[PDB]
Amino acid sequence: KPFSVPVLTVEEMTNSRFPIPLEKLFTGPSSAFVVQPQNGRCTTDGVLLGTTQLSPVNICTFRGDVTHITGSRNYTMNLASQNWNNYDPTEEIPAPLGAPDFVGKIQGMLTQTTRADGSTRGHKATVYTGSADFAPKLGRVQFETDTDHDFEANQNTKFTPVGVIQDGSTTHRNEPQQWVLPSYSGRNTHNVHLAPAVAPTFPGEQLLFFRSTMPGCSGYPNMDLDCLLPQEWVQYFYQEAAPAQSDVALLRFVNPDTGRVLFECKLHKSGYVTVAHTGQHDLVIPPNGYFRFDSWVNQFYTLAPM
Amino acid sequence: PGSKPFSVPVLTVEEMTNSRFPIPLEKLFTGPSSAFVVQPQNGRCTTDGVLLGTTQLSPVNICTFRGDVTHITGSRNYTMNLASQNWNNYDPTEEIPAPLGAPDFVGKIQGMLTQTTRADGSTRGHKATVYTGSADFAPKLGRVQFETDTDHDFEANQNTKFTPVGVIQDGSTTHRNEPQQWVLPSYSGRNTHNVHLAPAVAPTFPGEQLLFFRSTMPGCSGYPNMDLDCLLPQEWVQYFYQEAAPAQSDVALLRFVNPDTGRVLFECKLHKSGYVTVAHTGQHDLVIPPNGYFRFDSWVNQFYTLAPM
Ligand SMILES: C[C@@H]1O[C@@H](O[C@@H]2[C@@H](O[C@H]3O[C@H](CO)[C@H](O)[C@H](O)[C@H]3O)[C@@H](O)[C@@H](CO)O[C@@H]2O)[C@@H](O)[C@H](O)[C@@H]1O
């Protein structure tokens, strides 16, 4: 079977940067910021990039055991691998795969099973991926919990992400910052083996973003989350692994209700999408609409305005 | 004849996801299932890509709930009147047992409720647990109740989401008596009959048992039974749905291959109605190479004799 994209509606698909479903399509200018997400990065021939991995549910999860920090409700987690094996920090990846690729305060729950009797406990925890001690690359991250005693040492402990939070004493929606990369090895360290930043070069083109709204758990957070590729596309390319004939796969978005092509876009072989539009726009689509790969084209093909 | 050739994805067990809870697959397990009914509504799909029961494509959506909430005064418990997944009105005339991705087992599912106030975008998040065994658990009728850690914080008439994390045990001193993964909830509440169910599955061929794709649900309190078995990995459901390869016969013969040795560890029967059986007798945890994966080799008849594993 030749190269293609799956027949999945936007709503039927999942965000590749957080374990939540896609809601809509959004385009806007990106010269004011850097677009360098590490999750949801995959070439059209199925080469995973950055911290990208196949499991949607594992995105922004952490695993390991925890050590309580006295005089606080904070626990340091010495990370294990996703399969509960030892973590190796010599792997040529920016951070353990599925690590958050944005600076924010991610709230969820820590859970733990005592091996001997199978007793369990669960508590609310938040991780500040902006914090100097956020060093998943070195196998350590800290969690702000509401307990100073319940978690036992040397037991398997999991973090399941739920949403994000904001400090309401400050300017609203100032956090999280989705386009700011964390320092995976902690403050004053340089990230390594990154998926490259993407920017539109062709005139009149903006990125097409696959947008979700992260749940907010406290305050006034910026809950917009844009991924370059839906998680399903990442899984699909990895499975198909169809080599790219050219730099760009021309895609058409089809409307089943009318039968006509609503808009067309450029799927770049390194794994991102551009459309011909100028300004901030939320795309209004038929909910049963879907993408279809029509042709291999070069980078400087001229898209019809949308 | 000459129809599109059926296949399964080249995915390791570890690379895949549980179809009954938003967690990764860990292991393969086989055991006897004559003592109970195997009738999960999640992770049900024919090999030709027809979704069954409460099954839907997104793993993250499994065991989630959406809607607005009404406080029960003088308590930390909230009733949720369910909305659709895309925040539209819930429709109870749909020919489905329950809202898609609804939990298909009786248990106490703990996670977090989150809510956004539309006017100013203020947000709140609290730990909540839902008892799918409870008499008032009627997701089919657009209602679920949550035991929360707040007695005031949630506003009415705002979009509210439940994100599942794991399961809990309590109300008893007996360990691992709950949850009960093979007990279907009464989707319309107690003393009501479930409808449009995916059918129960049982091994028919002599000496054969079901093959289970097993995960360990996180435990958030007490001593719960955290074993979770799905008939189909979520990715297989996603795969079959996309490919929609017609079934030549009742059964697709699968071989589990070891890349390290190059040989076949074991073979199994993938029934076109969407479940797997192997030739083994008794409870068994499969010891597999972590890079091992399934491969469809041939269509065989229903009464084919599997190599013992
Ligand atoms: C914007 C505000 O955010 C959330 O509240 C937290 C505060 O939490 C506390 O007060 C809220 C009610 O406002 C509620 O009683 C909660 O149980 C309690 O912890 C507090 O953590 C501050 C600290 O700066 O941050 C937020 O204001 C949320 O619960 C509120 O509903 C509201 O959205």
XYZ file of C-alpha atoms and ligand atoms in Angstrom:
648
model
C 0.000 0.000 0.000
C 1.467 3.377 -1.138
C 1.946 6.497 1.004
C -1.218 7.899 2.557
C -2.757 9.603 5.579
C -5.482 7.845 7.597
C -9.195 8.522 7.109
C -9.738 9.945 10.581
C -11.737 13.048 11.437
C -10.078 15.689 13.596
C -12.398 14.849 16.503
C -11.663 11.131 16.096
C -7.957 11.825 16.677
C -5.698 12.574 19.632
C -3.241 15.291 20.607
C 0.361 14.126 20.323
C 1.644 16.487 23.043
C -0.880 15.677 25.796
C -3.131 12.661 26.443
C -6.308 14.389 25.240
C -8.429 14.316 22.048
C -8.135 16.856 19.232
C -10.873 19.506 19.109
C -10.168 21.775 16.130
C -7.777 23.044 13.472
C -6.018 26.376 13.969
C -3.601 28.457 11.920
C -1.657 31.568 12.836
C 1.697 33.331 12.381
C 4.696 31.820 14.180
C 7.506 34.310 13.525
C 7.029 35.790 17.018
C 7.854 32.452 18.683
C 9.842 29.272 18.059
C 7.995 26.117 16.992
C 10.135 23.240 18.275
C 7.903 20.609 19.938
C 9.589 17.282 20.754
C 6.382 15.256 21.043
C 4.264 14.651 17.942
C 7.344 14.685 15.710
C 7.571 12.080 12.940
C 8.722 12.028 9.299
C 6.247 10.853 6.649
C 8.368 7.704 6.232
C 7.761 6.847 9.889
C 10.938 8.038 11.611
C 10.191 9.106 15.186
C 11.886 12.350 16.271
C 12.600 14.151 19.539
C 10.870 12.501 22.491
C 8.102 11.107 20.293
C 6.734 7.643 20.975
C 3.719 5.610 19.920
C 1.645 5.545 23.125
C -0.787 8.482 23.430
C -1.633 7.627 27.047
C 2.055 7.710 28.083
C 2.523 11.311 26.947
C 3.453 13.462 29.969
C 3.600 10.431 32.274
C 6.489 9.578 34.585
C 7.489 6.337 36.302
C 9.918 5.416 39.057
C 10.315 5.484 42.821
C 10.189 8.527 45.090
C 12.223 9.986 47.939
C 10.515 12.430 50.280
C 12.161 15.810 50.759
C 11.952 16.664 54.460
C 10.334 19.987 55.372
C 8.205 19.892 52.229
C 5.353 18.111 50.459
C 7.712 17.593 47.537
C 9.059 14.261 46.333
C 11.962 13.618 43.992
C 11.314 10.790 41.561
C 14.245 8.802 40.252
C 12.828 7.914 36.865
C 12.466 4.372 35.628
C 11.956 3.458 31.986
C 8.392 3.175 30.653
C 8.515 -0.610 31.179
C 9.586 -0.189 34.842
C 13.195 -1.101 34.012
C 16.257 0.971 34.856
C 16.510 4.306 33.080
C 19.606 4.872 30.914
C 20.598 8.527 30.393
C 23.088 7.660 27.631
C 20.256 7.123 25.159
C 20.546 9.614 22.296
C 17.223 11.275 23.070
C 16.500 14.707 24.585
C 14.642 13.122 27.496
C 12.659 9.975 28.340
C 10.145 9.568 25.518
C 6.784 11.210 26.170
C 8.385 13.780 28.465
C 6.531 17.113 28.352
C 7.924 19.398 25.638
C 6.691 22.667 27.139
C 7.411 24.766 30.215
C 4.378 24.535 32.464
C 2.878 23.348 35.728
C 1.342 19.958 34.964
C -1.096 18.670 37.553
C -2.245 15.085 37.921
C -1.945 12.217 40.379
C 0.911 10.173 41.806
C 0.017 6.540 42.501
C 1.954 3.786 44.221
C 1.692 0.067 44.937
C 3.461 -1.558 47.869
C 4.818 -4.791 46.411
C 4.495 -6.925 49.553
C 0.756 -6.568 50.258
C -0.526 -4.688 47.218
C -1.648 -1.755 49.341
C -2.168 1.382 47.263
C -2.268 5.156 47.686
C -3.048 8.037 45.330
C -2.373 11.757 45.715
C -2.652 14.937 43.689
C 0.714 16.044 42.329
C 1.983 18.874 40.140
C 5.294 19.017 38.281
C 6.921 22.285 37.266
C 8.746 21.477 34.053
C 10.176 25.000 34.160
C 11.841 24.386 37.527
C 15.641 24.231 37.748
C 15.361 20.728 39.219
C 13.313 19.445 36.281
C 15.905 17.021 34.918
C 14.108 14.036 33.321
C 17.134 13.588 31.059
C 19.125 12.840 34.223
C 16.310 10.630 35.496
C 14.986 13.048 38.135
C 11.895 15.256 38.449
C 10.177 16.795 41.486
C 6.467 16.693 42.338
C 4.460 19.074 44.512
C 1.967 16.969 46.468
C -0.490 17.529 49.323
C 1.092 14.861 51.568
C 4.360 14.854 53.540
C 4.358 11.167 54.526
C 2.056 8.799 52.617
C 4.438 7.826 49.787
C 6.824 4.998 50.643
C 10.393 4.872 49.338
C 11.658 2.226 46.921
C 8.183 1.411 45.559
C 6.925 1.730 41.972
C 5.343 5.166 41.547
C 3.464 6.575 38.543
C 2.433 10.086 37.526
C -0.677 10.360 35.351
C -1.181 13.837 33.858
C -4.639 15.418 33.970
C -4.137 19.095 33.168
C -2.338 22.367 33.886
C -2.569 25.191 36.442
C -1.825 28.926 36.628
C -0.892 31.355 39.417
C -3.884 33.700 39.523
C -1.995 36.363 41.474
C -0.193 37.089 38.207
C -1.340 37.897 34.653
C -3.977 35.464 33.386
C -3.024 32.856 30.778
C 0.660 33.750 31.207
C 1.285 30.053 31.836
C 1.826 27.393 30.687
C 4.024 28.368 27.723
C 3.512 25.670 25.094
C 6.272 26.828 22.710
C 9.008 27.106 25.364
C 11.166 23.974 25.622
C 12.165 22.728 29.100
C 15.804 22.222 30.050
C 15.654 18.428 30.113
C 18.866 18.156 32.176
C 17.980 21.014 34.554
C 18.797 24.734 34.571
C 21.920 26.066 32.819
C 22.135 22.920 30.686
C 21.721 22.554 26.926
C 19.206 20.139 25.424
C 20.534 17.532 22.998
C 19.313 15.490 20.022
C 16.319 17.799 19.537
C 13.820 17.534 16.744
C 14.504 20.646 14.667
C 12.475 23.839 14.925
C 10.044 24.300 12.038
C 9.159 27.548 10.317
C 7.248 28.398 7.125
C 9.496 29.755 4.355
C 7.062 30.099 1.474
C 5.273 33.476 1.263
C 1.672 33.649 2.451
C 2.009 30.374 4.353
C 1.373 29.708 8.029
C 1.593 26.506 10.046
C -1.554 24.426 10.427
C -1.906 23.450 14.079
C -3.798 20.481 15.478
C -5.320 22.087 18.532
C -6.688 20.807 21.827
C -7.767 22.472 25.059
C -5.871 21.094 28.047
C -7.987 20.772 31.184
C -7.350 23.507 33.746
C -7.095 22.355 37.348
C -6.428 25.707 39.048
C -6.143 29.418 38.267
C -6.306 31.043 34.830
C -4.060 28.940 32.558
C -3.442 29.165 28.824
C -5.010 25.841 27.880
C -4.286 25.956 24.136
C -2.086 23.093 22.951
C -0.917 22.852 19.348
C 0.792 19.794 17.863
C 2.325 19.641 14.382
C 1.090 16.077 13.845
C -1.903 14.235 15.289
C -0.778 11.242 17.352
C -2.582 8.902 14.948
C -0.531 10.220 12.016
C 2.651 9.457 13.968
C 1.444 5.893 14.567
C 0.328 5.587 10.940
C 3.584 6.737 9.307
C 5.572 4.515 11.658
C 3.498 1.508 10.600
C 3.311 2.278 6.869
C 6.856 3.657 6.618
C 6.196 4.767 3.042
C 9.257 6.542 1.595
C 8.661 10.134 0.488
C 8.895 10.677 -3.261
C 9.303 14.432 -2.767
C 9.723 17.149 -0.123
C 5.983 17.716 0.266
C 2.814 15.651 0.299
C -0.084 17.740 -0.996
C -3.177 17.048 1.117
C -6.820 17.911 0.473
C -9.438 18.241 3.208
C -12.731 16.787 1.977
C -16.331 17.571 2.964
C -18.635 14.527 2.804
C -21.790 16.651 3.165
C -21.089 18.788 0.073
C -18.478 16.587 -1.616
C -16.155 19.499 -2.379
C -12.615 20.296 -1.228
C -12.732 22.850 1.596
C -9.001 23.580 1.633
C -5.617 22.124 0.713
C -2.376 22.018 2.698
C 1.275 21.003 2.476
C 2.393 18.039 4.580
C 6.172 18.402 4.731
C 8.042 15.112 4.723
C 9.887 16.022 7.937
C 6.466 16.111 9.604
C 4.571 19.400 9.721
C 1.721 21.141 7.892
C 1.420 24.541 6.218
C -1.567 26.344 4.685
C -1.920 29.513 2.618
C -3.427 32.014 5.054
C -2.422 35.258 6.773
C -3.492 35.973 10.351
C -4.948 34.100 13.312
C -7.783 31.772 12.316
C -9.753 28.905 13.856
C -10.774 26.623 10.990
C -14.505 25.891 10.784
C -14.767 22.363 9.412
C -17.404 19.736 8.704
C -17.131 17.361 11.702
C -17.123 14.363 9.344
C -14.359 15.959 7.270
C -10.993 14.257 6.768
C -7.599 14.615 5.080
C -6.669 12.853 1.837
C -3.234 12.592 0.237
C -3.511 13.517 -3.448
C -0.024 14.151 -4.827
C 3.711 14.424 -4.235
C 4.789 18.022 -4.844
C 7.890 20.144 -4.320
C 8.275 22.682 -1.492
C 7.449 25.738 -3.620
C 4.068 24.599 -4.900
C 1.490 27.389 -4.532
C -1.446 26.475 -2.282
C -4.939 27.849 -2.853
C -5.745 30.461 -0.157
C -7.916 29.293 2.750
C -11.590 -13.559 -3.896
C -8.448 -11.445 -4.197
C -9.794 -9.129 -1.492
C -7.434 -6.784 0.368
C -4.966 -8.923 2.356
C -5.657 -9.011 6.095
C -2.850 -8.239 8.520
C -1.973 -7.183 12.054
C 0.382 -4.296 12.889
C 4.070 -4.808 13.653
C 3.758 -3.601 17.237
C 5.267 -5.095 20.367
C 3.032 -5.732 23.359
C 4.890 -2.973 25.214
C 4.420 -0.520 22.324
C 0.637 -0.964 22.516
C -2.201 0.228 24.746
C -5.004 -1.366 26.765
C -8.387 -0.949 25.076
C -10.362 -0.988 28.347
C -8.306 1.592 30.277
C -5.992 4.431 29.175
C -2.769 2.608 30.119
C -0.057 0.666 28.242
C -0.118 -3.092 27.707
C 2.375 -4.953 29.904
C 1.989 -8.683 29.294
C 0.185 -11.602 27.680
C -1.828 -13.940 29.900
C -3.935 -17.047 29.318
C -6.229 -18.845 31.738
C -9.590 -20.614 31.986
C -12.695 -18.430 31.601
C -15.533 -20.954 31.896
C -16.263 -19.833 35.473
C -17.199 -16.324 34.290
C -18.561 -14.417 31.305
C -16.131 -12.566 29.059
C -18.253 -9.778 27.613
C -16.223 -6.554 27.613
C -17.788 -3.715 25.606
C -14.532 -1.814 25.163
C -11.830 -3.221 22.890
C -14.403 -4.929 20.673
C -13.866 -4.853 16.912
C -14.285 -7.317 14.082
C -11.147 -8.038 12.087
C -12.847 -6.298 9.142
C -12.954 -3.071 11.161
C -16.529 -2.903 12.486
C -16.615 -1.291 15.950
C -18.712 -3.121 18.550
C -20.140 -2.369 22.000
C -18.954 0.914 23.527
C -15.699 0.885 21.567
C -14.216 4.003 19.998
C -10.851 4.844 18.443
C -9.199 7.197 20.944
C -7.439 5.438 23.866
C -7.358 8.606 26.017
C -11.171 8.793 25.895
C -11.623 5.430 27.649
C -13.307 5.723 31.071
C -13.673 9.496 30.724
C -16.864 11.475 31.349
C -17.993 14.941 30.250
C -20.846 17.248 31.206
C -21.987 19.655 33.896
C -22.349 18.863 37.587
C -24.930 19.398 40.326
C -23.907 19.458 43.972
C -25.671 17.269 46.519
C -25.913 19.703 49.415
C -24.203 18.701 52.648
C -21.903 16.292 50.822
C -18.771 16.059 48.692
C -20.723 14.104 46.091
C -21.718 15.485 42.682
C -24.135 14.283 40.027
C -22.987 14.731 36.429
C -25.539 15.066 33.654
C -23.522 13.716 30.735
C -22.793 15.693 27.589
C -21.356 14.295 24.352
C -17.600 13.860 23.874
C -17.401 17.087 21.845
C -19.396 18.934 24.549
C -22.708 18.752 22.668
C -25.953 17.376 24.098
C -25.931 13.695 24.967
C -28.193 11.529 22.801
C -29.725 8.457 24.502
C -31.468 7.158 21.350
C -28.172 5.935 19.903
C -28.198 2.173 19.293
C -25.347 1.622 21.737
C -25.172 0.121 25.261
C -23.616 3.290 26.695
C -21.677 6.425 25.692
C -18.628 5.207 23.785
C -15.557 4.598 25.943
C -17.761 4.080 29.002
C -16.249 1.720 31.598
C -17.245 -1.901 30.951
C -16.551 -3.225 34.454
C -17.914 -2.846 37.975
C -15.371 -0.924 40.014
C -14.493 2.230 41.908
C -12.620 4.384 39.412
C -10.664 7.260 40.916
C -9.271 10.175 38.948
C -9.778 13.922 38.721
C -12.679 16.179 37.848
C -11.723 19.434 36.133
C -13.829 22.440 35.195
C -13.459 25.718 33.306
C -15.625 28.794 33.905
C -16.447 30.171 30.446
C -16.792 33.826 31.477
C -13.292 34.433 32.910
C -11.564 31.130 32.151
C -10.974 30.348 35.822
C -10.294 26.648 36.413
C -10.485 24.030 39.174
C -9.393 20.406 39.559
C -10.280 17.879 42.266
C -9.895 14.161 42.965
C -13.116 12.260 42.232
C -14.215 8.615 42.300
C -17.153 7.001 40.478
C -18.690 3.680 41.473
C -19.839 2.012 38.260
C -21.389 -0.653 40.484
C -23.660 1.894 42.157
C -27.412 1.686 41.534
C -27.470 5.275 40.252
C -24.747 4.617 37.686
C -26.786 5.207 34.538
C -24.441 6.609 31.838
C -26.843 5.249 29.216
C -29.353 7.733 30.657
C -26.749 10.489 30.876
C -26.032 10.248 34.610
C -23.006 9.392 36.740
C -22.177 10.368 40.330
C -18.764 11.318 41.709
C -17.465 11.225 45.284
C -15.165 14.290 45.375
C -12.816 16.027 47.841
C -14.740 19.312 47.705
C -18.108 20.398 49.096
C -18.397 23.729 47.239
C -15.806 24.381 44.527
C -17.592 23.119 41.383
C -19.907 25.619 39.686
C -23.127 24.550 37.969
C -23.732 24.813 34.218
C -20.031 24.666 33.331
C -18.194 22.073 31.247
C -16.707 19.453 33.574
C -14.328 16.607 32.678
C -13.424 13.397 34.488
C -9.951 12.014 33.784
C -9.439 8.440 35.043
C -6.160 7.483 36.742
C -6.782 4.155 38.448
C -8.960 2.110 40.792
C -9.505 1.864 44.548
C -10.746 -0.634 47.107
C -12.564 0.007 50.380
C -15.859 -0.561 52.169
C -14.411 -3.969 53.021
C -11.357 -5.564 54.625
C -11.137 -8.290 51.982
C -8.226 -7.683 49.618
C -8.566 -7.653 45.817
C -12.311 -8.382 45.920
C -12.770 -5.333 43.683
C -12.818 -4.172 40.996
C -14.483 -7.002 39.072
C -13.344 -6.658 35.473
C -15.732 -9.283 34.040
C -18.895 -7.858 35.644
C -20.736 -5.584 33.220
C -22.239 -2.462 34.777
C -25.967 -1.882 34.412
C -25.590 1.065 32.048
C -29.134 2.377 32.632
C -29.006 1.792 36.396
C -30.023 -1.098 38.644
C -32.768 -3.556 37.658
C -32.511 -2.437 34.027
C -31.369 -4.517 31.054
C -28.331 -3.584 28.979
C -28.880 -3.306 25.223
C -26.921 -3.619 21.968
C -24.103 -5.427 23.762
C -21.099 -6.905 22.028
C -21.574 -10.654 22.535
C -19.807 -12.697 25.209
C -16.778 -14.690 24.050
C -15.717 -18.168 25.175
C -13.264 -20.766 23.881
C -15.153 -23.474 21.978
C -12.345 -25.640 20.608
C -11.179 -28.338 23.053
C -8.031 -27.574 25.056
C -8.167 -23.892 24.085
C -8.248 -20.834 26.343
C -8.648 -17.123 25.645
C -5.445 -15.120 25.188
C -5.520 -11.960 27.285
C -3.739 -8.662 26.667
C -3.031 -7.621 30.219
C -2.293 -4.342 31.990
C -1.914 -3.349 35.632
C -4.271 -0.508 36.503
C -2.863 2.043 38.940
C -4.208 1.697 42.482
C -5.100 4.915 44.299
C -6.402 3.496 47.595
C -6.833 0.225 49.478
C -6.118 -3.259 48.137
C -7.739 -3.437 44.685
C -7.456 -6.154 42.045
C -5.555 -4.168 39.420
C -5.517 -6.864 36.712
C -7.118 -5.717 33.447
C -7.535 -7.992 30.419
C -8.643 -6.858 26.959
C -9.471 -9.194 24.065
C -7.938 -6.820 21.521
C -5.159 -4.258 21.876
C -6.460 -0.755 21.178
C -4.062 -0.406 18.240
C -5.531 -3.528 16.615
C -8.995 -1.963 16.851
C -7.554 1.199 15.305
C -5.733 -0.878 12.673
C -8.667 -3.053 11.578
C -10.951 -0.028 11.406
C -8.599 1.808 9.039
C -7.614 -1.173 6.877
C -11.005 -2.932 6.803
C -9.499 -6.059 5.229
C -12.255 -8.632 4.518
C -12.122 -11.954 6.371
C -11.639 -15.008 4.153
C -12.709 -17.329 6.963
C -13.785 -17.501 10.596
C -10.211 -17.498 11.886
C -6.923 -15.721 11.168
C -3.937 -17.833 12.213
C -1.338 -15.681 13.978
C 2.281 -16.473 14.823
C 4.209 -14.652 17.544
C 7.717 -14.098 16.230
C 10.992 -13.608 18.097
C 13.381 -11.218 16.293
C 16.297 -12.293 18.515
C 16.081 -15.967 17.488
C 14.107 -15.600 14.260
C 11.707 -18.355 15.346
C 8.017 -18.589 16.220
C 7.393 -18.670 19.979
C 3.723 -19.626 19.730
C 0.679 -19.427 17.464
C -2.884 -18.339 18.205
C -6.368 -18.004 16.724
C -7.663 -14.511 15.973
C -11.406 -15.002 15.490
C -12.850 -12.557 12.954
C -15.362 -11.337 15.555
C -12.398 -9.986 17.517
C -10.828 -12.206 20.164
C -7.847 -14.551 20.528
C -7.484 -18.163 21.711
C -4.470 -20.427 22.290
C -3.898 -24.122 22.959
C -3.030 -24.185 26.651
C -4.650 -25.525 29.812
C -4.418 -23.575 33.065
C -3.382 -20.117 34.245
C -0.227 -18.917 32.479
C 1.806 -15.726 32.180
C 3.494 -15.633 28.776
C 7.237 -15.020 28.785
C 7.908 -13.101 25.588
C 10.826 -11.268 23.998
C 10.070 -7.545 24.466
C 10.697 -6.903 20.747
C 8.423 -9.806 19.775
C 5.268 -9.167 17.743
C 2.281 -10.808 16.029
C 2.116 -11.790 12.363
C -0.867 -13.005 10.343
C 0.194 -16.046 8.319
C -2.997 -17.664 7.033
C -6.766 -17.970 7.140
C -7.694 -21.339 8.649
C -10.987 -22.999 9.544
C -12.665 -22.744 12.941
C -11.580 -26.236 13.992
C -7.886 -25.832 13.179
C -5.572 -27.408 15.763
C -3.121 -24.929 17.301
C 0.390 -25.935 18.291
C 0.413 -26.191 22.107
C 1.945 -23.225 23.966
C -9.089 30.759 40.139
C -9.498 29.771 41.217
O -8.505 28.717 41.202
C -8.717 27.648 42.096
O -8.479 28.030 43.433
C -7.142 28.044 43.895
C -7.151 28.234 45.378
O -7.713 27.096 46.001
C -8.747 27.352 46.923
O -9.896 28.161 46.882
C -10.802 27.570 45.957
C -11.972 28.520 45.688
O -11.491 29.699 45.027
C -11.318 26.281 46.551
O -11.936 26.559 47.801
C -10.147 25.330 46.768
O -10.599 24.191 47.472
C -9.074 26.017 47.555
O -7.907 25.212 47.561
C -5.720 28.431 45.864
O -4.982 27.235 45.651
C -5.094 29.566 45.083
C -3.671 29.819 45.578
O -3.149 30.976 44.913
O -5.067 29.236 43.700
C -6.396 29.188 43.239
O -7.043 30.400 43.532
C -10.126 27.045 41.958
O -10.369 26.015 42.910
C -11.192 28.142 42.054
O -12.486 27.605 41.788
C -10.908 29.221 41.009
O -11.009 28.666 39.710
